[PDB]
Amino acid sequence: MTARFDLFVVGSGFFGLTIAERVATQLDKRVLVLERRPHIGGNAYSEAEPQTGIEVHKYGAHLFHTSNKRVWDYVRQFTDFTDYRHRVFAMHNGQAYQFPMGLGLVSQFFGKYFTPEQARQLIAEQAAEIDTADAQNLEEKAISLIGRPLYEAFVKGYTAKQWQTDPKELPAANITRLPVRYTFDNRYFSDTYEGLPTDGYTAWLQNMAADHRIEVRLNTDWFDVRGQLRPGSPAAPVVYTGPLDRYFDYAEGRLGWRTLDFEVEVLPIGDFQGTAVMNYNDLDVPYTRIHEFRHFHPERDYRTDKTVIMREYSRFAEDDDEPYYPINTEADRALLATYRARAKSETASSKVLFGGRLGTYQYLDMHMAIASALNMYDNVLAPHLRDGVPLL
Amino acid sequence: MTARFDLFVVGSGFFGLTIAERVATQLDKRVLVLERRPHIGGNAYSEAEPQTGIEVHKYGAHLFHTSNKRVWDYVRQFTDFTDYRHRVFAMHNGQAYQFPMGLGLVSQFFGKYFTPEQARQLIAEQAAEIDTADAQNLEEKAISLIGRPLYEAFVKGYTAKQWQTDPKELPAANITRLPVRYTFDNRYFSDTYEGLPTDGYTAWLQNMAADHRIEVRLNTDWFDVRGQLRPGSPAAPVVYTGPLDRYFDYAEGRLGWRTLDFEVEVLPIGDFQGTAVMNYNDLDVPYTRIHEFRHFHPERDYRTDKTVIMREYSRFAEDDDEPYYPINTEADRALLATYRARAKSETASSKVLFGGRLGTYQYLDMHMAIASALNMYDNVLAPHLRDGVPLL
Ligand SMILES: Cc1cc2nc3c(=O)[nH]c(=O)nc-3n(C[C@H](O)[C@H](O)[C@H](O)COP(=O)(O)OP(=O)(O)OC[C@H]3O[C@@H](n4cnc5c(N)ncnc54)[C@H](O)[C@@H]3O)c2cc1C
Ligand SMILES: Cc1cc2nc3c(=O)[nH]c(=O)nc-3n(C[C@H](O)[C@H](O)[C@H](O)COP(=O)(O)OP(=O)(O)OC[C@H]3O[C@@H](n4cnc5c(N)ncnc54)[C@H](O)[C@@H]3O)c2cc1C
Ligand SMILES: O=c1ccn([C@@H]2O[C@H](COP(=O)(O)OP(=O)(O)O[C@H]3O[C@H](CO)[C@H](O)[C@H](O)[C@H]3O)[C@@H](O)[C@H]2O)c(=O)[nH]1
Numbered sequence: 001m002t003a004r005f006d007l008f009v010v011g012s013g014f015f016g017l018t019i020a021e022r023v024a025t026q027l028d029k030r031v032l033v034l035e036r037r038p039h040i041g042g043n044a045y046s047e048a049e050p051q052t053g054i055e056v057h058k059y060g061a062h063l064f065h066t067s068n069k070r071v072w073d074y075v076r077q078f079t080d081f082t083d084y085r086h087r088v089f090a091m092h093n094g095q096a097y098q099f100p101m102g103l104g105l106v107s108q109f110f111g112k113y114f115t116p117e118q119a120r121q122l123i124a125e126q127a128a129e130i131d132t133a134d135a136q137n138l139e140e141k142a143i144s145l146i147g148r149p150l151y152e153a154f155v156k157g158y159t160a161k162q163w164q165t166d167p168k169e170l171p172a173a174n175i176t177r178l179p180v181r182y183t184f185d186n187r188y189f190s191d192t193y194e195g196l197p198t199d200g201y202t203a204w205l206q207n208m209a210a211d212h213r214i215e216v217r218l219n220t221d222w223f224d225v226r227g228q229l230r231p232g233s234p235a236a237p238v239v240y241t242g243p244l245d246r247y248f249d250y251a252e253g254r255l256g257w258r259t260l261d262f263e264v265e266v267l268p269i270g271d272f273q274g275t276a277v278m279n280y281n282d283l284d285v286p287y288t289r290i291h292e293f294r295h296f297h298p299e300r301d302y303r304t305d306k307t308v309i310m311r312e313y314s315r316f317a318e319d320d321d322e323p324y325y326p327i328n329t330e331a332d333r334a335l336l337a338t339y340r341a342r343a344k345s346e347t348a349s350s351k352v353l354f355g356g357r358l359g360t361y362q363y364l365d366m367h368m369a370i371a372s373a374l375n376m377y378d379n380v381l382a383p384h385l386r387d388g389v390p391l392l
Numbered sequence: 393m394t395a396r397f398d399l400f401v402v403g404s405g406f407f408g409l410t411i412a413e414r415v416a417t418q419l420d421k422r423v424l425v426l427e428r429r430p431h432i433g434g435n436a437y438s439e440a441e442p443q444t445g446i447e448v449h450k451y452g453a454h455l456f457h458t459s460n461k462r463v464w465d466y467v468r469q470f471t472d473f474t475d476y477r478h479r480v481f482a483m484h485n486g487q488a489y490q491f492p493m494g495l496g497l498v499s500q501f502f503g504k505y506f507t508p509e510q511a512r513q514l515i516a517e518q519a520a521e522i523d524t525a526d527a528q529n530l531e532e533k534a535i536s537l538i539g540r541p542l543y544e545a546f547v548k549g550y551t552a553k554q555w556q557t558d559p560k561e562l563p564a565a566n567i568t569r570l571p572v573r574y575t576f577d578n579r580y581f582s583d584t585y586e587g588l589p590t591d592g593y594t595a596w597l598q599n600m601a602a603d604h605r606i607e608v609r610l611n612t613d614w615f616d617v618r619g620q621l622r623p624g625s626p627a628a629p630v631v632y633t634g635p636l637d638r639y640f641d642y643a644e645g646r647l648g649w650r651t652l653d654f655e656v657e658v659l660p661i662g663d664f665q666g667t668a669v670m671n672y673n674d675l676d677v678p679y680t681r682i683h684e685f686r687h688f689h690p691e692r693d694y695r696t697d698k699t700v701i702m703r704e705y706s707r708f709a710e711d712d713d714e715p716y717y718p719i720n721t722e723a724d725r726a727l728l729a730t731y732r733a734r735a736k737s738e739t740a741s742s743k744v745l746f747g748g749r750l751g752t753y754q755y756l757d758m759h760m761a762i763a764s765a766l767n768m769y770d771n772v773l774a775p776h777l778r779d780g781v782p783l784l
């Protein structure tokens with residue numbers, strides 16, 4: 001009369017594996033993880049390019065960073081981190097600029113050196129139209145943070161290619177992902193802890209699912225097998241991390257997502273751009289940015305006659321496309337609210353939880369997803385599986 | 393019939409303390425360290441500025457870095473290190489530039505973006521006059537490494553103020569202290585390990601001399617007390633780290649040194665320059681660079697209404713001045729060779745060793761001095777004190 005598993009988890013991304021690992025290890029329960037893709041790790045999956053040996057982040061560059069010590073201590077159970085600090089340069093009108101907002105950018109773009117005080121004054125004038133507290137959308141927030149001349153030169157074009165949506169229709173939270181500084185500090189992130197997985201992302205992800213009580217089935221869509229699996233384990237909750245709208249057959253409508261296409265190219269030169277990520281802010285170029293993956297790991301020594309680069313292209317996610325970014329327009333949020341209510345119903349009726357980037361239609365970085373997973377574990381899943389508490 | 397001490401060490405700088413600590417701790421011997429100054433640590437001595445609490449490197453900014461793992465492991469016995477990575481910006485004609493040699497510098501100074509390949513080609517043309525293998529002096533080496541336009545803009549002026557000596561008369565080793573890169577990596581150093589002492593330099597230095605078998609006498613010139621001390625410990629060797637020429641009363645002549653004057657100023661603003669060190673490469677300004685010490689320790693949170701800056705001025709060392717830099721002209725090296733022979737004589741006749749920046753008239757960074765000290769300990773001092781082997 002035994003259930004085969006104690007928990008089902010849909011998706012082997014960071015959210016899924018964090019849920020799977022915590023449940024398996026801390027509660028001594030058996031977890032079936034179901035992954036539609038041929039590999040685990042979700043969008044964080046990485047792979048060594050054959051010719052160079054250089055690790056390639058297959059679904060776009062993944063840079064780990066957090067100010068959450070709990071998360072930092074947790075992820076280091078599965079991987080070491082290098083001392084890499086992420087920096088991004090921006091290409092605009094044939095010149096490469098220091099980035100993001102700071103004295104480096106300001107001095108370059110305005111042609112002379114600005115003191116921290118002088119820079120604050122200049123941006124304050126150019127941000128006069130709108131104040132940050134009053135800013136509703138991306139365009140308003142960006143102008144209020146870096147001034148209009150910088151907004152038009154480094155945000156408007158890039159945002160056009162990345163979203164193809166009116167900047168007045170995009171969330172302000174999008175642009176506030178970028179630090180706004182009045183120093184020469186061009187660190188792209190401002191979190192306490194930061195690094196790349198020493199032995200790559202896939203090793204890190206494999207360590208998380210390594211527990212014997214965790215079984216991961218690859219090439220398995222949950223909607224193909226849930227009719228059979230759940231009867232085998234009727235009491236077992238389901239943690240779903242795929243697209244929220246798709247879970248309900250797009251009943252209420254289709255949430256707006258962006259998806260990404262990549263062009264991976266091995267060049268017969270040692271160094272293409274001299275840096276890990278170069279943003280392309282001008283419209284006269286179809287890609288949003290270019291990754292050169294050798295610069296991700298300077299501590300590894302790679303051949304200097306070849307290098308791997310990756311151009312990144314953005315478009316709207318079609319019916320079968322894998323969604324990368326939630327657009328979150330006002331209409332999208334309205335649609336989200338309906339699915340959320342349905343999600344709350346699925347939790348009540350079928351013990352189905354919803355988590356992750358796709359599961360909650362949120363713009364979630366790796367660390368936020370893991371923190372979100374730990375939250376769901378601590379406050380929802382663990383009390384249920386261990387102490388019988390309902391899931392709402 | 394006992395000697396009071398087993399070893400005399402003149403100077404409490406990194407060389408002296410490394411010698412003192414190793415001898416005391418590893419050989420169980422008693423060391424008298426004699427320091428002419430009111431404080432230990434030599435030029436590495438640091439002090440918190442009262443108003444802000446910000447640590448000030450009193451004798452110029454000290455940034456620790458090494459590729460020597462042995463040294464790295466050794467110094468961490470006495471201090472923790474922060475994750476600070478040193479970066480320098482250069483001020484030229486009212487614009488702040490990325491620095492040192494790299495794509496950042498090249499793109500700024502030449503007004504458009506250069507690929508790693510394009511940058512190599514450009515510099516190769518501008519470095520045509522002289523090849524690095526053939527370069528004898530500073531000017532030739534610099535031109536062969538960064539090309540003449542960059543040399544004239546960022547090296548010639550700075551070198552004039554720092555040395556006031558013909559660049560054709562200065563060692564090539566001076567300019568090769570700076571990494572030459574064709575990436576956007578603007579790390580000022582290229583060593584494996586790097587950091588600032590978490591609790592400051594003075595704490596680090598005090599930990600090294602902390603051993604009970606080590607006695608440090610401050611405000612004590614060796615030439616004032618050696619007549620009395622050495623009879624008390626006749627067999628005890630002497631490790632001298634003060635100026636080599638001064639040790640012999642400038643008998644053969646005076647070695648060329650540079651000395652430094654500092655202007656320390658507390659400004660009523662939170663941020664003066666947005667960065668730890670700003671070089672000033674133009675001649676229309678008397679100082680070589682400006683240090684803003686709050687940017688040394690971003691992990692410490694300081695008041696944002698005040699900041700401590702320090703302008704650095706360079707001149708020739710007079711009779712009583714403390715020497716900072718060995719000039720090392722051909723004439724200086726000739727003079728050095730004579731003192732070296734005298735040094736070898738003092739070793740033979742009086743068991744007097746010569747080490748350190750001042751003791752050997754060498755342009756020694758902190759890590760090189762410590763490595764030099766460990767070398768002297770392993771190969772000269774320890775075999776002598778422990779196994780009776782002579783010092784030559
Ligand atoms: C281009 C890009 C760059 C990024 N860079 C960073 C960065 O630098 N730093 C950072 O912290 N974050 C970064 N992120 C964000 C990060 O990738 C996500 O936070 C991360 O993927 C979190 O995992 P998640 O499980 O919530 O979503 P996902 O990892 O996408 O996990 C979802 C998984 O569910 C599976 N799945 C979906 N539907 C089904 C189904 N029906 N049946 C079975 N399986 C299914 C999918 O196959 C997928 O593997 C980046 C994201 C992108 C797109
Ligand atoms: C402006 C500046 C910036 C620097 N920045 C860096 C850096 O960023 N990173 C790095 O690695 N290195 C740096 N250095 C170099 C570093 O300071 C030296 O390597 C370091 O001081 C090594 O110690 P040393 O004992 O060989 O010389 P010193 O530390 O100068 O030690 C000599 C000591 O001997 C004492 N003394 C001299 N004569 C007598 C006497 N007759 N009697 C008693 N005592 C005497 C002096 O008082 C002095 O304290 C910098 C140096 C300068 C000048
Ligand atoms: O040059 C830029 C960069 C960003 N933005 C706006 O800011 C938003 C967010 O920028 P992100 O850099 O965070 O975009 P991504 O989410 O795509 O960023 C991903 O690409 C980066 C590569 O350096 C980092 O890895 C980053 O954390 C990772 O989330 C963008 O939508 C865009 O609208 C710009 O306008 N111009």
Ligand SMILES: O=c1ccn([C@@H]2O[C@H](COP(=O)(O)OP(=O)(O)O[C@H]3O[C@H](CO)[C@H](O)[C@H](O)[C@H]3O)[C@@H](O)[C@H]2O)c(=O)[nH]1
Binds near residue numbers: 455478547567570
């Ligand atoms: O902008 C510059 C910088 C250096 N040089 C030449 O290169 C030589 C060496 O440069 P250093 O920066 O190493 O000069 P310092 O020895 O004075 O350097 C000290 O000041 C720096 C502050 O960033 C670092 O702490 C450095 O390691 C420390 O030794 C200089 O003599 C100078 O001749 C220039 O021409 N222009």
